């Protein structure tokens, strides 16, 4: 793409600079360039990719929610088409970012990912970006978008339970996000709560095996599970 002339290592270096500068759109463009070099990503590189797009789409989602709230209130004086148009503009940009990430995953990150840690990470991301599409979907494809998220999360869950310990941060983060999927997207709050609780309790029982540094990583995500459970119960 626009990054085709830049060295892979320079793209990664610049992604790290962009992160320090809180330039997440640039960070994402650099990481997209790096992915498009065609080589597999290391753990650190996978995390740069995820951070960049999480921040970009996170900003878009927050803006979409503000606009959707304003639009909903307007449909409870007539102010014309502008609120819908601008919500649609932000929505279309959001969808474009999601399609970009899903495209990277499909061409060809997932198919080359053989190790559990990489394959679960990418399948989790696939679930996440279909979940963001589902948040804004209102038409004929809504059910299929929801099912695409579910299917990606479920494949990730199946691999994670076979291949990773219950405290592995990727396994924990996957469960956290799939539980949110159940609560917010699939209208399955009991499934959400059961998943969060089971994940927390199984992790608790495996903490004894960990170093101090691994313990810190795992417990941080466990706290997020507890935070959601507190919100939901």
């Amino acid at each position: 793409g626009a990054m085709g002339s830049m060295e892979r290592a320079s793209l990664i270096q610049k992604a790290k600079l962009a992160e320090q500068a809180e330039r997440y759109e640039d960070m994402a463009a650099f990481m997209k360039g790096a992915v498009e070099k065609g080589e597999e990503l290391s753990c650190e590189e996978r995390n740069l990719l995820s951070v960049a797009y999480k921040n970009v789409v996170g900003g878009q989602r927050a803006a979409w929610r503000v606009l959707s709230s304003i639009e909903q209130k307007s449909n409870e004086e007539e102010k014309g088409p502008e609120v819908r148009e601008y919500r649609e503009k932000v929505e279309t940009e959001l969808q474009g970012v999601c399609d970009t990430v899903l495209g990277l995953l499909d061409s060809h990150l997932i198919k080359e990912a053989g190790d559990a840690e990489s394959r679960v990470f990418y399948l989790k991301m696939k679930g996440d970006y279909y979940r963001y599409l589902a948040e804004v979907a209102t038409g004929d494809d809504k059910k299929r978008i929801i099912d695409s998220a579910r299917s990606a999360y479920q494949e990730a869950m199946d691999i994670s339970k076979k291949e990773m310990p219950p405290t592995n941060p990727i396994r924990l983060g996957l469960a956290l996000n799939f539980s949110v999927f159940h609560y917010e997207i699939a209208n399955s709050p009991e499934e959400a709560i059961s998943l969060a609780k089971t994940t927390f309790d199984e992790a608790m029982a495996d903490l004894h095996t960990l170093s101090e540094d691994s313990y810190k990583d795992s417990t941080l995500i466990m706290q997020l599970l507890r935070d959601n459970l507190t919100l939901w119960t």
Binding site: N177, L224, L231
Partner: peptide, 5 residues
């Protein structure tokens, strides 16, 4: 809004 990572 619930926590995700």
């Amino acid at each position: 809004f619930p926590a995700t990572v």
